[PDB]
Each structure stands twice: as C-alpha cells, then as structure tokens.
Design a protein around this nucleic acid. Structure first.
Length: 310
RNA sequence: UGUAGUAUGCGGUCCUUGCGGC
C-alpha cells in the first residue's frame, strides 16, 4: 500500500533550533513527522518522493555510493598497507551525488550499474522557498519545501493496514494540508521483489554485501553511533563478518515535542539517509525480502535498508 | 507591518528684405 500525498502548498519540517529567533530553516521530511499524519488517518516501511510526468515513478535519496559522474565507489583494500579505501575506478577522491534515484534504476543499482536516465537532480524534484516579513519586530523569515508541479511524497506502508482511500489531511509544520490517495503497489516494487532472488544469489556467490540506507536510522544501542553492530547483521544469517566500510554524511540531530508528557522528547542522532555500508559477510543471507529494518523506531519509518551486490 | 508627493533647478530659443523687373 502506498499513500500518495500531493502537496497543494509548501511544506515545513521544523529544525531542532527554536524559532525569539525569528530566522528558521527547513529540512527533509522525517519519519516521525510523517508517521503522525498516517496515524491521524501498524508500521511504516518508509517514504520516498514520487514524480508523475506522463509516467509515475518513485525516487529514493541518491546513494552516497554514486559520484558526480555516476561512477560507483567500491571499497578495495591494500594488504601492503593493510588499509581499505573507496576507489571510484576513475579517481581516489570523490563527492556524493545529490539528487534522487528511481526504483527502476535502483533495481539495476544493486547490481553495480546505473544509467544516466535513471537519476534525477534535486533541483528537478523540489526547491527551498524563503518567506520574509511573515508577521514592528514580530517578522520572522521561514524556509519551506516547494515541490514540483507533478511531484509529491509517497509513503510506503505494509499492506496489513487499511483506512480512508482518498481525502485531504494536514501535515508538516505550520498549518498546511496535502491531498492523499491510496495507490496499490506499482510495478517497480514487484520487479524488485522478483529480482530479489537473483540479487541474493549473486550476493551469496560473491561473498560481498552492501547495505543502503534509504531512510535515517538510529543505530545507537546505549548512546548513538554510526558503528554497525555485528549482532544485527548476524540475525539475517551472516555467520561472520570480516570488514565494515561505512560512508555517509553528517548525522541528523532531531527531537520532538511529546504532547502526551507535555515535554520535549530526548535529542537523538541518526545516520543520514543515503549512507551505504560495505560488509564482507561469511555464509549467506537468509532474508527473504530486499528491505530490512535497522536500529530503533523502525515502526515510524526509520532504518529501511536495501541489499546490494558488488 | 506601520510612516513616505519622482520632486526641485531649465525661455522651443538662434538664423533669415514680401521681394525682383515693366
């Protein structure tokens, strides 16, 4: 089941900093923010963007593996120095490629190949819009997310829940609203599920595994850290792990105002979406699905990760 | 948001036979 929400207006997701600070910024939608919308209409698998321009397609955050020239980076290790570096096969230094990757390109991406037409830049999906003088000194400037003409937010939720099909509901920060409809699973997820067996066989035969985080994950057990615990990987069937090479970005620091306790929630650090881990696993993967949940708060749409080969 | 005059200063001037011849 997919909740397709077209924003009639701009959307706001409050930054952790308070806003007498009139200046205010905006961030990408958070799983805790969108979870409240669906619960106002169970677990949430995650959320992507959707673009309906002639055809309807779903876009996830561009993996940090992909470079500017659409060149994949693989972690290769030198035993002479005994150190592993992420080589792009065209240079030793690289930068992450911002934008979004389609599911139709994602299916091929996990095999180690990507096409130019399978990616979309960030400027073609949504932009940031600044408003000044909103309301002698009461004026505050607020940045919001302005979506494209034929684009919106798709929320991927397991088909075990049901509710009203179509309507209008309020989401985000300030009192805005979007039009939501219930759409069945597109052919992209079906194709991914069909090719999951082949890609899992490739992963098993090659002895290499890649974890791609399509959503932010709070992996911290006692505190909060980007380190990948071996116990979590052992649950899926990994007998042993040799080396772990994680590449991501600045951790997303977020909290919230808990209305139940009338007090703010504890501040939490999460691994940013699009980060990729490379793991040299031993044995085979027993997972029967191409998507798994990691960390805590996985019900709200946190820690959705895909499997890939290299 | 509230308050706020595209306004002040500048000459359509200078130059020219209503003549030439019966």
């Amino acid at each position: 089941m997919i909740l397709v929400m077209k924003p009639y207006d701009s959307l706001l997701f409050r930054e952790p900093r308070p806003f007498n600070n009139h200046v205010a910024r905006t961030i990408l939608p958070l799983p805790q923010t969108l979870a409240g919308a669906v619960r106002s209409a169970f677990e949430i698998l995650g959320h992507f963007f959707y673009r309906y321009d002639g055809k309807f397609e779903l876009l996830v955050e561009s993996p940090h593996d992909v470079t500017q020239n659409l060149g994949l980076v693989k972690p290769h290790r030198i035993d002479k120095l005994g150190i592993t570096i992420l080589m792009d096969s065209e240079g030793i230094k690289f930068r992450p490629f911002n934008g979004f990757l389609k599911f139709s390109g994602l299916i091929d991406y996990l095999q180690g190949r990507i096409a130019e037409d399978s990616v979309v830049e960030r400027q073609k999906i949504f932009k940031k819009e600044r408003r000044v003088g909103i309301a002698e000194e009461h004026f505050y400037q607020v940045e919001m997310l302005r979506f494209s003409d034929d684009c919106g937010i798709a929320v991927w939720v397991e088909d075990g829940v049901d509710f009203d099909d179509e309507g209008i509901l309020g989401v985000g920060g300030e009192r805005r609203f979007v039009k939501f409809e219930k759409r069945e699973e597109p052919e992209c997820i079906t194709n991914l599920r069909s090719k999951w067996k082949k890609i899992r066989d490739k992963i098993n035969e090659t002895g290499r595994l890649k974890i791609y985080l399509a959503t932010p994950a709070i992996l911290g057990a006692k505190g909060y850290s980007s380190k990948l615990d071996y116990d979590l990987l052992g649950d899926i069937g990994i007998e042993r792990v040799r080396s772990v090479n994680f590449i991501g970005g600045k951790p997303v620091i977020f909290s919230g105002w808990d209305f139940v306790t009338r007090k703010p929630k504890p501040t939490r650090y999460a691994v940013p979406a699009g980060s990729v881990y490379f793991v040299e696993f031993e044995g085979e993967v027993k997972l029967d699905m191409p998507y798994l949940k990691l960390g805590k708060l996985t019900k709200l749409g946190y820690g959705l990760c895909f499997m890939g080969v290299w």
